[model samples]
Structures are given as structure tokens and as C-alpha cells.
Target chain A: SPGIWQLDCTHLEGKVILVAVHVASGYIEAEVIPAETGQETAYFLLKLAGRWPVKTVHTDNGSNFTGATVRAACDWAGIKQESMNKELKKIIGQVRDQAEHLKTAVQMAVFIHNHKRKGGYSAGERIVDIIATDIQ
Target chain B: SPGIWQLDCTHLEGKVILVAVHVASGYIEAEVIPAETGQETAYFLLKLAGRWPVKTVHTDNGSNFTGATVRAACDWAGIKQESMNKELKKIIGQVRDQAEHLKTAVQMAVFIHNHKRGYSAGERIVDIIATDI
Candidate 1:
């Protein structure tokens, strides 16, 4: 099961980043796009729909996610966009100081996030769905 | 300026990684997805178009990049798909040892590639262009 994916945004390097998090595995996708507007955000949503058999996509009523064009794109792609905002700030705050070196801040944050060891397990462990032979 | 962005694929942890690299800035986006199909590739391309006004996308003669769906996505996005494979191999090889630590290997490769120090003149300690700082 592909499970639900969450959408959220943040700012850095004088640009906006659109973030998508998979509910089950916690794998994330982030990009410093031209804008967080309808065209770009919708593109992200539609692309996710195509990437997998996405049954549900949750996002806040950010004008970008609700634009007519955004809706049209999803219709052509045959995707259903749900409404909800997942908290991405916790991860952002945790990694802000360590995550860096363009968007490397966000990249590092997510990379660390998805891979960071926690209680002898990590998001990497979860996504791969196996116990690592080497946890070093 | 929206310049050429390169698309390529690599394997790790029993899955495929589709990578997109902006030629001018070297800023890259990589993801571990299910399969390397035309549908998936096109989604990545179209998503790239959304990320920025991508003027041109350079890829090899891979069938996945030449499919009708990919063509249609690029068509709808008004993006021009050019044919030319870039050397992502060098970056992959150089970083395999250091990049990691899922996909962390590739993430670290690109993160380090875009952030690592180059020759002292143009880029002193790190890539200002890709980092955008």
C-alpha cells in the first residue's frame, strides 16, 4: 500500500520549498521551486499521482493547492486531492542548525530525517522495510 | 535563467533512483522510486517544469525518456526535451564511499557535490551557485 502523502512548505535561501511526506514510510520529497503557487504545487501533486497509485493527498487550503488550474491538472490526471496539513516544522526545527551547506539546509534536514538513527532504527530502515545488516 | 537540467538513474538498496541535475547550478533532486518507467520519468520531468521554468531537459536515448506519456507531459508543460547524457557516473563513483550514511548514498552524493569545495578561484570552499547562499 502506498499510503497517504502529506504536503507542506517552508522558506530558505530566499525561496519557497514544497515538501511532501509519505505517511507510512516518512520518505519525503522537497524542492526549492520558482513559487509555491498553483502551477508549481499542482505539478507536484499531479506528479505524485502518477508516481504511484495515490489514493489520497492531503494539503492545507493554501491558495496554490486550490486554484482552478490546479484542480484541472488533477482532473486530467485522475487524482483526488484531499485537504489537511501535516506538521513538518518539527523536523525542520530539529535539523535547521545541522542541515545545510542550497537548499542543502532542507536537503540535509530531510536526508538526516529519513536516515537518522532513532532507538536503533531510522526512517531509512522503515522505508527499506528490513533490518540493516550493519547499523554502524 | 532556466538552463539545461540532466536526468539519469542509479541503483541502490534494491530500488532505482531517478536523479535530475541542473547543469548551470548543479542543484540536484533524487528520489528512490518503484520503477524506471516512462510514466515515472515523465512525472519527474513535468514536476521539474513546475519547480522552475525549465528551458531544456537533457537525457540519453533511454526508452523510458522517449515514451508517449513523457512526450505528452513535456508537451503540456511546454518544455523542450533534448538528447544528451551527462556524466553523473563520476559524481556517483566519487561519493559512493562518502555519500550515505535509503537513498542517503545518492542524497549525500548530490548534497556533497553541490556543496563541496572546488578549485580556489571560481568556487573557493563550496558551491555558491548550487547552494544559492
Candidate 2:
């Protein structure tokens, strides 16, 4: 079996950039063009590893990820496909507060994750891991 | 302003495809892949144009069409973008019935526009405009 393709985002231009994840090694592949749609995803897979074989793919129901391009690509590759959604939510110290007394507040308990995180891990820990790895 | 990038999707296998419309000229071009999310939408646009000189883009608001990615792409293009949910509802209802999903719906719509409809102006002339030649 090949690696799984997971839907994720990279930030560029102060905006979000959609991407595909390699399941085994956690390598990121650029699936979308700078201003392009999710269609390029299929092409990305076809050319993955410079014409290497793909065994499996996974993505969310989001239109670009698991939609049509990637689906068709998987079908041709004889790969297995799995799809699900992971909801994200969070609260910020300044979210509800206006410009306070130079920000008179402390980081309070925030509940942002409302769905089970995927990637074979709980959503909350994945969130924590993402932040911890990036920050520390 | 520079022209948009035109990537051919014939290399990939897909049951349906999307055709992008230019609002100003009512022209259509390119069979688009799924734009499942807003950022993907933005990513698509940037690739099409290469250089972001896009002044105004028009589409309807759906999870597929709105987000930081689309917004940022527009900003980069130095163009103002507008999305109309009402128009999209009409278009979606008319064209999407053939497919259970949105990407297929979009592809069908583009096909209908290309072979079925006659274009009077804009970028679609090269693609969708029916001619004797």
C-alpha cells in the first residue's frame, strides 16, 4: 500500500494554503497552485514520487480535498479511500474583550475543538502537539 | 494586468470538471477541478493568473468559495471580489441535479456552457463559443 493523503493547510500570503499530507513520514506535498483550485491535487498524486505507486488516500469532505480530482486519482491507482470531518473551535483572551486596561486579562480555559481529531490521534492532543512543536 | 494561468487537467482522471467564468465578459475558460474549500479556491486563482493582477472575481458564497485564501488571493491580485449566494443557488439548482455532489455539478455546468450555450463575449470565446469553423 502507498501512503495516505491527509488534508491540511499551510499559511502563506497571510492566508491559508491547502495541502496534502503523507501518512507514514509526515511529509507535506503541495496540492494546490498559488491561486488554483483543488483539481491540481489529482495531478500531484499522479506525479507523486515521480510516478511512484500510491496505495491509500484519506481526506475530509471539504470540496477540494476528497472531492473529485483526488477521488478519481485513487480509483485509477486502486487505492483505498477514507473520509471524515474534524471541527475546530477556540476562545481567545481578546476575543470577547474590547481594548481593556492595557489588556487586563489572563489566558483562560478555552474550548475550541468540538470534533475528534483525525490522524489516528485525538483532536485535542493533535492541536496541542501542533502548537508545542511550532512554539517550543 | 497579466493573463491567467491555464493548466490542463486532462492528465488526471475525473468524472466531472468545473469551468471558471469571468464576470466582466461573461466568458468561460478552463475545466476546473474541485474547489472544495476557500483556500483551495484562492490557490486555484493564483495559479491561473501567475501574477495576481485580478481586479474583480465574481462567484457565490459557499464553503467552497469563501475564506481567507480566496480573500487573500484577491488582495494579492489587486482586485475586488464579489460572491452572490442567491445567483449561486439558482445556478446550482439548475446544473447540479445531474450529480449528487458539487464538483460533478460544477463540471456538468461547464460542459453545458461550453457545448450548449453560445457565448457573446470574453475569455470563453476560445473555449465555449460555437463557431462553424
Candidate 3:
């Protein structure tokens, strides 16, 4: 499965931020940093492959994603480069719809999210189980 | 000062109880008897001689109080008998108004009455003895 792209940085005051997504699970995680330029993102991509082989990279139209530095790194790693898709933008729309429904203040969505057993490999359990199995 | 009237019904059965009130102090004295007959009331009044030298005996229009036996007893006792005046009906009216406001349930009224007020004077005061009981 094509896992998410990651980036690292230690420049503008020494901070490293990263993004990690489990490809099959669709869970997202991100970290903010002071600087995450094209060069740093490219190095982060290479380091990421040691954990999961790098097959693809997707980024928004940020200069950090489209700059010449990240382009060169992608060409070197033979990793596919792609623009962020419209389908991924739906997360924001879903959040907006939920906010509108909860305008009344008292809402039960949190209870449902935590307790309901919605099918399709529960995000956290799958990741933890896989990581544990890999270690064992 | 009118004095106390003592009546012992231990020797008698099926006694009728008649209570009379003093006008100024509003104190009550009662006599108990086998019947509310004229003779029994007369004998009862005669027995009150040494204690209360009452000048007037005011009573409602009851056979025991208004009958010839009572009049004869009063004549002998040198006491005048007077029928109760209608003005006392005002007192009865005030008592009725109070009955309406006190609509709390029996148990609740008892509970409050025990702690709330003894109701002895103008201001209703809580009675401690009832609360202790």
C-alpha cells in the first residue's frame, strides 16, 4: 500500500515536523515545524522508506512540494510525485457539515465515534497490531 | 376571678362534657356528666360555690344551660344567666379564615407545627415541645 508522504526540518530554530499516514488504514498524523522546505521534505521521504518502501508522494501546491529541490530528490529516488487530489479535500467539507449539525451545542457525535463499531479495519487497532506483529 | 370547676367522671358512664370560657382571660373550665339534663347541670353549678363566685353564666341556647333547672340553680346561687351574644360570631369567622390558609397535609402540618410556631399570641411562634415529641 502507498503510505503517506513525510517531511523533516531543523532550520528556522531547529524543529523537525513530519506527516505519516497508513496507506491501507487511511489514518492521518502530522507534526508542525519551523521549516520544512523542498530539500528537507526530500530527505524525510528517503528516511521514511526505511520503514515503508517509498512508492509515491503527494503534496499540495505549496512551493515546498513543487520546488526544483524536491523534484530532483524524487527523480533520484524513483518515487512517483503527484498533486494533492480533490478527493482528499473532502475531509474539510466533512468537518464543516459536522460543525453545522452540532450548532445546537449538545451533540452525540463524539459518543457515536468512540463507541460505534464501524467496519473497515479500525484505524488505531490495525496500525498497532501491524507494528506489533512486525516486531514479533 | 372565676375559679376552676372540677368534675370527676370515674364513677359515671357515658358522660356529656360542657366547657365554659371566661370572657376577659379566655380561660376554659369543663364539667363532665352522665347527661346534659337540667338537674345534673343545676347540681354541677351548685358544686362550684366556694371556688368561682361568678355573677353571670353565659351560655348558648342549650337545654342544659337554658332550662328551668339551670335557672333555679342560678337563682339559688345568686347568679344571673345570660344567652351568648351574636357578636361572638365574628370570632368564629376569623377562625374559619385561618382554617383555609392552613391546608398543609396532616403529617406536614404536624411537622411544621412542632417546629414552626406554638401559635400562642399575635405572632405564631414555633413550639419546641411538639417538635421534641
User: Which candidate number maximizes TM-score?
Assistant: 1
DockQ of each: 0.03, 0.02, 0.00
| CA deviation > 4 Å runs, candidate 2 | A1-136, B1-20, B28-41, B47-53, B58-71, B78-100, B117-133
Best model number under DockQ: 1
The candidates, ranked best first by TM-score, are 1, 2, 3
Candidate 3 Cα deviation (angstroms), residue B33: 99
* Candidate 1, A50-99: lDDT as tens digits: 33334567777678866786777566555577711133445556656742
lDDT of 3 by residue, A42-106 (tens): 54454344223356766554768878766765665567776111222233234435333221001
Question: Per-residue error at B125 for model 3, in Å?
Answer: 87
Off by over 4 Å in 3: A1-17, A83-136, B1-133
Interface RMSD of 3: 41.8
DockQ of 1: 0.03
Better of 1 and 2 by TM-score: 1
Clashes by residue pair, model 3? B116-B126, B117-B125, B117-B126, B118-B125
Model 1 Cα displacement at B36 (Å)? 22
Q: Model 3 - which docking category?
A: incorrect
lDDT of 3 by residue, B6-101 (tens): 222211124354444444333233334447777666655544431223556665546566577668656755666651112223332333343222
Better of 1 and 3 by lDDT: 1
Docking class of 2: incorrect
